[PDB]
RNA sequence: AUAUCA
């Protein structure tokens, strides 16, 4: 199992999205992360106080997880940080950063328009956090001067002074990960003709953002607590723990590291390099050359599929699996590990029809029944029966696979020396085989219907196919040309009730799709039904008696 | 000081206790958990008031487990000390460093240095005492202290205090 | 896309269809507050036929020797002739039936009679007939008041919305409108006696059953009507093979709110 | 209301919100040749009073957010001269219930 | 087998709330973390044995809860964090409506 | 009228194939596209750009570009959508989970 | 691992991989439940995916015996790529780069084995013999084309 | 370490089953260890869903001379229920 | 806020979902050796026990019916009509 | 699991300011003047002078002993022994804090009888002084209006020297003659 | 990654 914690169990009621304040990234962190080395204390078999577990997460079936201990199947893994040499853009915002610069003064950090402009006070009024930022921008982008005095809220003759600074605002454009401005200028009233062309440094953008008023940035999307605009530009880098980027130690000359561990090491190496350059005699242009390398590695780590930029590739020619790309597609973490996931107590095989099964039942192959299990609680009502299936064991049909004690530890009836002399106690759980009349979820994929997943009664049968009643064919959209179907087993009394009480086959007969029956008589039975019911059709006594007896609820009246 | 505070505690009752002596066991477990307790937020939770009217409310059954969880809303007498609070207490311990004073549930310690200069340590006494020109402070003596500051320490709150200023000291 | 757009839609305990924002999508599920499984195509008689054919079917005139209910129809037949007080009630009855006819002709402009509605009234009558071994010879033990008022009363018990206030009460009236036109058409005095030949107990039973069935017929708060609707359009789209863009590629145009559509056309009447 | 043949200069249009609490509306004569409200597909919209609105929201336990919205520029919202915040009660025929009442708040 | 997106939908259509929870939790992913009550993060150094709690940086050795979420979400959350985004998890509400 | 035309159109696509879908289903879709005040499409642009929860929107099509924006706008997901509780592995607030269940000690002590 | 209940010195335990459990063969107590497929897990590091479509492929295998632990990607052309930024970011890797270049003497051994028709196991021994003796003071100043020979 | 729960008895001391022995699920056809230090188990078991009799077993070296061994397993599949035609 | 019993306006009838959940919950509790409020007339399956308890309205549970605003109406299983 | 209050405030991400607790009448968030009882009603802070407190606890444990025997059906040095007996009956016994508290309270209470604590409570709660001062005035025996204003510094300009000195006189007069 | 299955 997973051991007990005195902590109160609660449910998640709200999720508060935001950006990481570098102060916080530093504060959470449990390790510095100084070296691009994985482990190998120079040709050794232990992690290096530098990258993965410098003080961090734990792996390799070993507890050591900084006092926390626990090890793998309990430790969530805790974060490290990396201190970046110079600020870099977070690839995802790069544009929100650009837009914020476009809205504010690149010298004083004040909104280019305010309460004095009518269109502004109107857009400022917008309740929607995103729509107001959207409107504020289309207005402020155009404004290329920080105004000192603006016409009063009555007369355009006597101009009232707002905030100071007269400075000209650059025309910002992106040059992939870089933001470069083009200042309008003045020179003999004309100029530009040929303006001031300079790239805006992370550090300068950071400083303006630091000076943006709480009231101002709050008028823009931003929140003073959870997401200040200064927190978009990366200064400190949260380093994810091994769980997020697993390693594998094959055979002493084979070892596999995750693409992130590679990408991190490049960030680090590029960092260590640029740190040495700034410390030493800064050659200006050899530094900004090393900065836009760091910028690339950090950027390409969160996103490798960047438009305009070259991909970071991994020796074999394949591009590095960035973080973005793990979340993204179907088969991503969202579409494929959360919104849908493979499951245990599942079973699949070829389906075949049966005129002798009842509408709501499902023929389950003995082998499938002998694998799938229901955890039943030992109770005065079942105690004797359960003890017998336990005695029967994992190989006999109505048998069991495991016994779950109060203590939490699982007894494997297949190997336990005490699998014979096993004496049950009320409250224990017997993980017993799936048995005739258990409710089970039966499903035929695609599943574009609620009727594509229905609850059936088990009927353990021989032969390797799932047998279904022919009239239930239509809702699933199944045939027996080589179709396979899925079976899911509920594990709780609650879950079972859900199946039997809401989604059982008989309930599903009249469907709301078209307010009519979604199952009817088909094929042989449809063909035979016409033939039987003609005026011409007469049956002799002998056959009438068999035909009558065949009806399972027949009154006994000829 | 010494407050009456309205408080609530979530209790998780196992199904086996879903008998008629349920409220009785809840009210009991409440008292076991809350009474005696010392928190930073509330101080010493000393005595739960109005036993006969402790609001149990309806307990929500926790889904995968059997157990029900209730938010037992109650009201109790608390003692939360503060810096600047002038308190009266009895000396308990006394050493070359100062003396501890018992103020209800908590101990407030007075440094040799947080007392006037005239009061000096006398080791040569049973029990060890502090001696002024006029006064004698020892294990049984009653003192009026000014709390200089508190430290929220686990299952207690301890504090440092002076008897140097005016209207403080022996009583 | 249909599923992802609708997922969070469901019927709340106020019969309101809302999303994860509590924003009202539909005020009442599918404008009638009924579960789709509990609905069946039924014929609204009143709707069609000649104005004369309607008259023969529905009109009772106790003040005319030819248009009264024959004493063969009910026991009170002889004593009922010329009852001015009773005739006031049959006038209300007929006047409502005429009101209903105009109204239904406004809703279904083509005059289409067959519509999916809850409670198969046709079947309840059929059952009353075998259940009570209805003798298509002997006269009924019903009063005109028994029929007329009985129906009037049953109607007040066909509950979809429960709140005690004009908004919610007017809302209830609204949801129940169409079903009642059907109910009034199938349970008008002349019809009940001449056609159905119901006894008082048979009628009393028919009424209770319409009520019970109707109530069972309402949607259950919790119904995830969002996903239901998505899948109820999704599944059929999966089975899809003037000349205008139709089928799968048109549904694609529709869902996308496609600006530059393939076959734009006006139908000028 | 100002019914104009072809256009109203942006000079003149700037005088529209110049005299409050009074309100000005501009209608292009060409739109009005046909009353859209008379169309098969156009149901009865009814403007609610401040008290009627207050009641709607009270009766359905609503915030103005939660109500379906008629756009300010909507042909019918124009015809009725609806203002932001104002609510309409739409009464449509139903193949389901015969009569269905929906509500729309102004944008 | 994969209890995929389209299967989630059918369960949502049926109204099988608890059957779905089971498929996604008990029958697969399900994991337990300790979160902080101040900054709704998975920061908590649960030394659940010595019964020590701590969320240093918050200096919170008191306001701590435990939650049952699918490990893939514990993962997703750690991933969003590594990417400088904070998915703060709170056990109470503050908005109403 | 936009709603009435939009339904008419949807209805035709189904009935052209000789299929029947009950009104309510098409009505709901038609209504959802409508409610906002215009023609909100069943696309990454339309519905997925509304005020619903961020994890919900992220489960369809725009995923990461939705979660970055969710971060810088400091969004708060109230977790009422089915998507959220599924991601979180909690009992969704749908049918069976649309209400709460309590034991009453009053009624409990009454039956014995 | 050793069963907490039994404890016999040769701890007889089985890995019931199919049920994903680690059992004590004597008492039957399950000693672990989380159990991972190492074959398929190793498929995520060394795959056949060179294109880049596999979502399972998420890491790469390295050789800690021969090149130590030098994790390093390479700036290269992708689908949407300007040939300008590739040059700059590569000209920027030039200033950050002696012994990290003497690894091209492995390219001297590899091109010598392939010219001598030598197997893949010989190159990797010649590369390990050269890495552990090219910086020795015992070899000092021997003919650098005769110490790899 | 980490031995397969399957049986190793059918292996001759060269680590192979002799051809002719009947096998079954989870049983060990080829015994292999990857010494690292004493040594982990790198053996090949027969697919758990199958069974049969070993047909032929051959031992060889390749282009560079790595010892490698191929094992053939023969079964006779008699038409059952879900069998397609 | 909790709606008073005299001001409750939700259905007097139990929803399919409610009934499925009550039966699920009781069966679960019965199965976890909770006290049974009915004569088991030889019954052993906790769902068939649950069905029996609900059949005689001897289930001590209450449905907290939440309204979109957050308020609620509490309804006893004893008081809910079971026409399902 | 620990105890919560009626103070619901949502500290979202924004950790601190936790501004110091002093008798500048700046007590905690928890010991604020505007409190809220379980019935939602805004109710003022309840501060007790050790005597008002002694009586409260005694009352509660006395009433508890009642229910404990009901549910079981089917001179100061003298007060110390009497109380130490009631604690053995109602309290958990492990709760040593209440034992010391009750002893301290018995030995330091200025007013013995409930009647006495009544008048104290009247006389004082008419000054408009904040519950903290009103308690410290009841629990600290002062003679000079300066003794009071020095020990309870918060009082400073809140009351006249003479008005406070008039109270201090009618407080001394109420002290139960131990 | 190709081939394939309904
Ligand atoms: Mg097929
Ligand atoms: Zn740890
Ligand atoms: Zn400026
Ligand atoms: Zn924290
Ligand atoms: Zn053992």
UniProtKB/Swiss-Prot annotation, chain C:
Post-translational modifications reported in the UniProt record: The tandem 7 residues repeats in the C-terminal domain (CTD) can be highly phosphorylated. The phosphorylation activates Pol II. Phosphorylation occurs mainly at residues 'Ser-2' and 'Ser-5' of the heptapeptide repeat. The phosphorylated form of Pol II appears to carry, on average, one phosphate per repeat. The phosphorylation state is believed to result from the balanced action of site-specific CTD kinases and phosphatases, and a 'CTD code' that specifies the position of Pol II within the transcription cycle has been proposed.
Compartments where located: Nucleus
Top-level division of the source organism's lineage: Eukaryota
Domain notes: The C-terminal domain (CTD) serves as a platform for assembly of factors that regulate transcription initiation, elongation, termination and mRNA processing.
Family per record: Belongs to the RNA polymerase beta' chain family.
Assembly and interaction partners: Component of the RNA polymerase II (Pol II) complex consisting of 12 subunits. Interacts with DEF1; the interaction is direct and serves to bridge RPB1 to the Elongin complex in a DNA-damaged dependent manner. Interacts with the Elongin subunit ELA1. Interacts with the Elongin subunit ELC1. Interacts with ASK10. Interacts with ESS1. Interacts with RTT103. Interacts with SHE2.
Name this polypeptide is given: DNA-directed RNA polymerase II subunit RPB1
Organism in which the protein naturally occurs: Saccharomyces cerevisiae (strain ATCC 204508 / S288c) (Baker's yeast)
From Swiss-Prot, chain D:
Location of the protein in the cell: Nucleus
Top-rank lineage group of the source organism: Eukaryota
Subunit structure: Component of the RNA polymerase I (Pol I), RNA polymerase II (Pol II) and RNA polymerase III (Pol III) complexes. Component of the RNA polymerase I (Pol I) complex consisting of 14 subunits: RPA135, RPA190, RPC40, RPA14, RPB5, RPO26, RPA43, RPB8, RPA12, RPB10, RPC19, RPC10, RPA49 and RPA34. The complex is composed of a horseshoe-shaped core containing ten subunits (RPA135, RPA190, RPB5, RPO26, RPB8, RPB10, RPC10, RPA12, RPC19 and RPC40) where RPA135 and RPA190 form the DNA-binding cleft.
Function text: DNA-dependent RNA polymerases catalyze the transcription of DNA into RNA using the four ribonucleoside triphosphates as substrates. Common component of RNA polymerases I, II and III which synthesize ribosomal RNA precursors, mRNA precursors and many functional non-coding RNAs, and small RNAs, such as 5S rRNA and tRNAs, respectively. Pol II is the central component of the basal RNA polymerase II transcription machinery. RNA polymerase complexes are composed of mobile elements that move relative to each other.
Family of the protein in this entry: Belongs to the archaeal Rpo5/eukaryotic RPB5 RNA polymerase subunit family.
Name of the protein in question: DNA-directed RNA polymerases I, II, and III subunit RPABC1
Organism: Saccharomyces cerevisiae (strain ATCC 204508 / S288c) (Baker's yeast)
Gene transcribed to yield this protein: RPB5
UniProtKB/Swiss-Prot annotation, chain G:
Region of interest: Disordered: 44-72
Zinc finger (TFIIB-type): 1-32
Superkingdom classification of source: Eukaryota
Subunit comment: Associates with TFIID-IIA (DA complex) to form TFIID-IIA-IIB (DAB-complex) which is then recognized by polymerase II.
Biological function: General factor that plays a major role in the activation of eukaryotic genes transcribed by RNA polymerase II.
Residues represented out of the complete protein: 22 to 173 of 345
Miscellaneous comment as given in the Swiss-Prot or TrEMBL entry: Present with 6750 molecules/cell in log phase SD medium.
Subcellular location: Nucleus
Protein name: Transcription initiation factor IIB
GO biological process terms held by the UniProt record: DNA-templated transcription initiation; RNA polymerase II preinitiation complex assembly; transcription open complex formation at RNA polymerase II promoter; transcriptional start site selection at RNA polymerase II promoter
Molecular function GO terms recorded: RNA polymerase II complex binding; RNA polymerase II complex recruiting activity; RNA polymerase II general transcription initiation factor activity; TBP-class protein binding; zinc ion binding
UniProtKB/Swiss-Prot annotation, chain J:
SUPFAM superfamilies to which the protein is assigned, alphabetical: HRDC-like
GO cellular component: cytoplasm; nucleus; P-body; RNA polymerase II, core complex; RPB4-RPB7 complex
Location of region: Disordered: 1-21
Pfam families per the UniProt record, alphabetical: RNA_pol_Rpb4
SMART domains in the cross-refs: RPOL4c
Keywords for this protein: Acetylation, Cytoplasm, DNA-directed RNA polymerase, mRNA processing, Nucleus, Phosphoprotein, Transcription
Superkingdom field: Eukaryota
InterPro entries named in the record: HRDC-like_sf (IPR010997), RNA_pol_Rpb4/RPC9_core (IPR006590), Rpb4-like (IPR045222), Rpb4/RPC9 (IPR005574), Rpb4/RPC9_sf (IPR038324)
GO molecular function: nucleotide binding; translation initiation factor binding
Any GO BP annotation: mRNA processing
Subcellular location: Nucleus; Cytoplasm; Cytoplasm, P-body
Family named by the database record: Belongs to the eukaryotic RPB4 RNA polymerase subunit family.
Role this protein plays: DNA-dependent RNA polymerase catalyzes the transcription of DNA into RNA using the four ribonucleoside triphosphates as substrates. Component of RNA polymerase II which synthesizes mRNA precursors and many functional non-coding RNAs. Pol II is the central component of the basal RNA polymerase II transcription machinery. It is composed of mobile elements that move relative to each other. RPB4 is part of a subcomplex with RPB7 that binds to a pocket formed by RPB1, RPB2 and RPB6 at the base of the clamp element.
Name this polypeptide is given: DNA-directed RNA polymerase II subunit RPB4
